[PDB]
Amino acid sequence: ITGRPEWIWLALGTALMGLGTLYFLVKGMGVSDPDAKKFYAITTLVPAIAFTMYLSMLLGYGLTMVPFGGEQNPIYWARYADWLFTTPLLLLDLALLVDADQGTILALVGADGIMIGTGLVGALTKVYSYRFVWWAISTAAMLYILYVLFFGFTSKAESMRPEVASTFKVLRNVTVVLWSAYPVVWLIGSEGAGIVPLNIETLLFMVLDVSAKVGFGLILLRSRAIFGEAE
Amino acid sequence: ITGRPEWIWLALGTALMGLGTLYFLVKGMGVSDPDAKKFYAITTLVPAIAFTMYLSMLLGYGLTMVPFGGEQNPIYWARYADWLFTTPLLLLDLALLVDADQGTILALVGADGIMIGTGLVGALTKVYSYRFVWWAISTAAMLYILYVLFFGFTSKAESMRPEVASTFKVLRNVTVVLWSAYPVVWLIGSEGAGIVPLNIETLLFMVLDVSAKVGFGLILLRSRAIFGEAE
Amino acid sequence: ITGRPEWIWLALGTALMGLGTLYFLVKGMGVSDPDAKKFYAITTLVPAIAFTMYLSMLLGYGLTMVPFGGEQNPIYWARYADWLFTTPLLLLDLALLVDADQGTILALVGADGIMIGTGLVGALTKVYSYRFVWWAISTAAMLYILYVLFFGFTSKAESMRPEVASTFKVLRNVTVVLWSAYPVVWLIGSEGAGIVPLNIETLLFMVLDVSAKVGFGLILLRSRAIFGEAE
Ligand SMILES: CC(C)CCC[C@@H](C)CCC[C@@H](C)CCC[C@@H](C)CCOC[C@@H](CO)OCC[C@H](C)CCC[C@H](C)CCC[C@H](C)CCCC(C)C
Ligand SMILES: CC(C)CCC[C@@H](C)CCC[C@@H](C)CCC[C@@H](C)CCOC[C@@H](CO)OCC[C@H](C)CCC[C@H](C)CCC[C@H](C)CCCC(C)C
Ligand SMILES: CC(C)CCC[C@@H](C)CCC[C@@H](C)CCC[C@@H](C)CCOC[C@@H](CO)OCC[C@H](C)CCC[C@H](C)CCC[C@H](C)CCCC(C)C
Ligand SMILES: *C/C=C(C)/C=C/C=C(C)/C=C/C1=C(C)CCCC1(C)C
Ligand SMILES: *C/C=C(C)/C=C/C=C(C)/C=C/C1=C(C)CCCC1(C)C
Ligand SMILES: *C/C=C(C)/C=C/C=C(C)/C=C/C1=C(C)CCCC1(C)C
Ligand SMILES: CCCCCCCCCCCCCCC
Ligand SMILES: CCCCCCCCCCCCCCC
Ligand SMILES: CCCCCCCCCCCCCCC
Ligand SMILES: CCCCCCCCCCCCCCC
Ligand SMILES: CCCCCCCCCCCCCCC
Ligand SMILES: CCCCCCCCCCCCCCC
Ligand SMILES: CCCCCCCCCCCCCC
Ligand SMILES: CCCCCCCCCCCCCC
Ligand SMILES: CCCCCCCCCCCCC
Ligand SMILES: CCCCCCCCCCCCC
Ligand SMILES: CCCCCCCCCCCCC
Ligand SMILES: CCCCCCCCCCC
Ligand SMILES: CCCCCCCCCCC
Ligand SMILES: CCCCCCCCCCC
Ligand SMILES: CCCCCCCCCC
Ligand SMILES: CCCCCCCCCC
Ligand SMILES: CCCCCCCCCC
Ligand SMILES: CCCCCCCCC
Ligand SMILES: CCCCCCCCC
Ligand SMILES: CCCCCCCCC
Ligand SMILES: CCCCCCCC
Ligand SMILES: CCCCCCCC
Ligand SMILES: CCCCCCCC
Ligand SMILES: CCCCCCCC
Ligand SMILES: CCCCCCCC
Ligand SMILES: CCCCCCCC
Ligand SMILES: CCCCCCCC
């Protein structure tokens, strides 16, 4: 484990995702509202999945070597197995908050799968220049997601209860800022141009992951928007 | 790329799926009917997924070598990753058109997963004679799907609006004819008996894919069956 | 095939899953109740999936070698591909029986995916002591599932029709007893401590699989709880 300088950030990430999972699990014990139960189930699964994948990276299972640039490059593939399941769950939290229609939910989840799937292909591609073709396709899929979150959901939240509109607006802004950083870290990190070393890259993804999952969840599950209007 | 004679058909397929995706995306911009939005989302995702997998084959990522018959045989595995997601989406288009019940939808999607999954196992199997055992199981799963589309959905469409009944009947006939060709191309192509060479096999799958996805989508999204009855 | 002593139990399992699939398929022909159709579709898919994965193990495709303990250990990975899809389908049978809320269904299916996913990682892990870390995480996920089936569903079934309450109680008890045996067989078998040899381990999993899928299905599909109350 300790033979890799980035191990400290993988261990911290593992701990923070595990602690986040347990807090949400305990906090959700005393909840019977069927609407609130939906948000607790979605939001608790997110850091639980991330916990297992951070642990796999810490123990060395989620790491492979990819030859490109005449070098064997360490690629943590477990990140994409994490994101494949956690990013659509996070979008479902937002879509259920605004009572989005089914067709829009399917478009979001499908574009998200394309985003993560093409990012994985780009991470494992051995022809250096082709890695950035996949990065560009994946980034186009992300821009579609961000467009929908702004010019489809925002207008839908305003016609909703005030507390669900204000909570959505906050979580929307958090998501757009944090998610946009991921393609940048990829491009300048060891998967892309190799400007930033792997140990610093790992620290950046850990800060982003914890903020986008645990921080996101703390804002959502403390809001009254997750409960139905009741007397 | 150009070192493979089949590259021209992979490049054409990539272009036609990309163009198809963009047309459906633009055409769906001016749509607010929640029913129509469902069909546009399903139908636009189909060629978008196929685009990415054709590109992976063009660039050489979606290709592996499988030893059988005393030879290293080029097997494009990316086809099955495509079909795993696009064939159930196409069946969902048909099932939603006739307002099929949930139990029937699950049976269709499950049989479809078995069809594609066993076809993938057959494509990667190293014992030559066993490849055709998997082909037979996969073909049995397809025949179940075709039976349901005829002796379960057809009777359901007649009790529906006339425009949804006539549109379903057309898309049903297109699907049964085109899908039935796939097991035949597999059997006589490089995955099976090896009668037809890979470059011709690739041309045939490209014609079938574009027809079953883009051609299918053009018929559906030009129909009024996708809109609810409104004044 | 016959070069492996466990082949006899893989062949028996294949036959019993295939026969089970055909019986459920025939029995479900004469069913039009939309509620009953749901249970028949879920319950017939379970042994059909298991059939294909037992066949892959029989023919040698679903087997790999994992080095640990200074030895190349035969690991049947196809079991986890089976369980990944069949265990959530079995939980869906139970959840639909008691009309569970959506949030609870998602929590069950998500915990089940974590259970199977971490068990697969543990089966393929090359550092011997780490294999049991994954076993423990997977077992914690199972205990969560069992808790929900007892202290969330049981109370919900009592407020239901008497026949659905008594049928659920029976299937609940069958599930908790049979599922609990799996982590024990893993721990003492070739994936874990290696006390029980592989051929005996394979026999035990076959008895458990057939009972948990075909036996489970025979109890459910003979009950009147799967039909709506009708005159
Ligand atoms: C509606 C939305 C959900 C739609 C989703 C969008 C999606 C279509 C976007 C594209 C996804 C696609 C790129 C997934 C590729 C997975 C692949 C990286 C797995 C590893 O295989 C890659 C190479 C080794 O580098 O295999 C070496 C050769 C091996 C012999 C490969 C044989 C196994 C194949 C991988 C079998 C295909 C399985 C499916 C891809 C499983 C789904 C994986 C997940 C990442 C989507
Ligand atoms: C309700 C419906 C959706 C049900 C679906 C029906 C489905 C059950 C039908 C059978 C599907 C099954 C054959 C999928 C097999 C995937 C497999 C080809 C992936 C590549 O692995 C094959 C060998 C190399 O040749 O791995 C070499 C050895 C490696 C060490 C393998 C270890 C990884 C395992 C593959 C882990 C299992 C992952 C799941 C199979 C992922 C789903 C893939 C998709 C193709 C279903
Ligand atoms: C809501 C719920 C459904 C959530 C589900 C819970 C889930 C997150 C729990 C953890 C699942 C995770 C451990 C799955 C790992 C699959 C992995 C074993 C496949 C084989 O790859 C392992 C190594 C060889 O030993 O690959 C060698 C290196 C290769 C180069 C690997 C590159 C391919 C990657 C495997 C791509 C990721 C694909 C996804 C993991 C596909 C889903 C598989 C299924 C088992 C979940
Ligand atoms: C909890 C994890 C989250 C919210 C991860 C989000 C990840 C992304 C938005 C990743 C995007 C990428 C691109 C847009 C292209 C480059 C490759 C990716 C996958 C890093
Ligand atoms: C857009 C792609 C489509 C509609 C693909 C359809 C593919 C099939 C219907 C494939 C069927 C197969 C068999 C029936 C057995 C032989 C292997 C397959 C997977 C080619
Ligand atoms: C039809 C198959 C069924 C119902 C299989 C159930 C399997 C389990 C409940 C497996 C559980 C495991 C653990 C709890 C940890 C050890 C590894 C597993 C996956 C065997
Ligand atoms: C979206 C965030 C990207 C900003 C990356 C900042 C990295 C600064 C760290 C110093 C770079 C290390 C280079 C010298 C080793
Ligand atoms: C009462 C609110 C705080 C509860 C404690 C939460 C502990 C989980 C770890 C959170 C750290 C990361 C927060 C986002 C920066
Ligand atoms: C379902 C369509 C299958 C028909 C295949 C027709 C192939 C004819 C092309 C000529 C065969 C090439 C053999 C000589 C190289
Ligand atoms: C107005 C209808 C035609 C629009 C142009 C569609 C261009 C997408 C490519 C379609 C070619 C394949 C059609 C099926 C044979
Ligand atoms: C949950 C069931 C686990 C019980 C396992 C009993 C196995 C007894 C078979 C004899 C053990 C073989 C050891 C000598 C070869
Ligand atoms: C009339 C009920 C029996 C029908 C025959 C079922 C045959 C399928 C194989 C069942 C054997 C396994 C039963 C569970 C132990
Ligand atoms: C194995 C991959 C299957 C999933 C394909 C994605 C489409 C799923 C459609 C689900 C239809 C709704 C069923 C109720
Ligand atoms: C990782 C594979 C999980 C999918 C298994 C297929 C069954 C899914 C059941 C979904 C139940 C409906 C939830 C609302
Ligand atoms: C185009 C939709 C408007 C909202 C999206 C904001 C774009 C942020 C740019 C992200 C940069 C990634 C490289
Ligand atoms: C048996 C259901 C009737 C409709 C299915 C038509 C069968 C077409 C044969 C396809 C040939 C594939 C080898
Ligand atoms: C803790 C929830 C109560 C019901 C679960 C029964 C636990 C059975 C123990 C299984 C042993 C697996 C190692
Ligand atoms: C080795 C660098 C080659 C540059 C390729 C950049 C491709 C980016 C595509 C974005 C449209
Ligand atoms: C090398 C050819 C061996 C023939 C096997 C055919 C199997 C087909 C099974 C269809 C029932
Ligand atoms: C080689 C045996 C090492 C023992 C590790 C046991 C780990 C079990 C963790 C359960 C909390
Ligand atoms: C609940 C605390 C979980 C912390 C265990 C993971 C941290 C790795 C320490 C080496
Ligand atoms: C929108 C046009 C997309 C065409 C790019 C793919 C074709 C491959 C050319 C080499
Ligand atoms: C319907 C009977 C299915 C039996 C075939 C599988 C058994 C393997 C025999 C070698
Ligand atoms: C993106 C930063 C999240 C901050 C988490 C703190 C929330 C406390 C209510
Ligand atoms: C299967 C052939 C499809 C033909 C596509 C043309 C549709 C234009 C309306
Ligand atoms: C767990 C044992 C199941 C027994 C199956 C027999 C059911 C006949 C109704
Ligand atoms: C009005 C809410 C502002 C939230 C933005 C937070 C950016 C990290
Ligand atoms: C909408 C604000 C985008 C912020 C992008 C930050 C990328 C590091
Ligand atoms: C009555 C519609 C006929 C459609 C069949 C088209 C076959 C390619
Ligand atoms: C229902 C007509 C089937 C046509 C099969 C064509 C196979 C090449
Ligand atoms: C295995 C075939 C079953 C025969 C019919 C059983 C009575 C519905
Ligand atoms: C009251 C029903 C008892 C069922 C338990 C069966 C254990 C195999
Ligand atoms: C609730 C009874 C548990 C039985 C466990 C059996 C494990 C072999």
CSV table of C-alpha atoms and ligand atoms in Angstrom, one decimal, chain B residues 135 139 142-148 150-151 176 179-184 187, ligand 16:
chain,number,residue,atom,x,y,z
B,135,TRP,CA,-25.7,-19.5,-31.2
B,139,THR,CA,-31.5,-17.8,-31.4
B,142,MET,CA,-34.8,-14.2,-30.3
B,143,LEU,CA,-37.6,-16.5,-31.4
B,144,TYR,CA,-39.3,-15.9,-28.1
B,145,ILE,CA,-39.0,-12.1,-28.6
B,146,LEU,CA,-40.5,-12.4,-32.1
B,147,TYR,CA,-43.4,-14.5,-30.9
B,148,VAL,CA,-44.3,-11.9,-28.3
B,150,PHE,CA,-46.7,-11.0,-33.0
B,151,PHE,CA,-48.9,-12.9,-30.6
B,176,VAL,CA,-38.8,-8.9,-37.5
B,179,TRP,CA,-33.4,-8.7,-36.6
B,180,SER,CA,-33.8,-12.2,-38.2
B,181,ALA,CA,-30.9,-11.5,-40.6
B,182,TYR,CA,-28.4,-11.0,-37.7
B,183,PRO,CA,-28.1,-14.6,-36.6
B,184,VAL,CA,-27.7,-15.6,-40.3
B,187,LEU,CA,-23.5,-18.1,-38.6
D,16,LIG,C1,-42.0,-18.4,-34.0
D,16,LIG,C2,-42.6,-17.0,-33.9
D,16,LIG,C3,-43.2,-16.6,-35.2
D,16,LIG,C4,-42.5,-15.3,-35.7
D,16,LIG,C5,-41.0,-15.5,-35.8
D,16,LIG,C6,-40.5,-15.5,-37.3
D,16,LIG,C7,-39.3,-16.5,-37.4
D,16,LIG,C8,-38.2,-16.0,-38.3
D,16,LIG,C9,-37.1,-17.0,-38.5
D,16,LIG,C10,-35.8,-16.3,-38.2
D,16,LIG,C11,-34.7,-17.3,-38.6
D,16,LIG,C12,-33.4,-17.1,-37.7
D,16,LIG,C13,-32.5,-18.2,-37.9
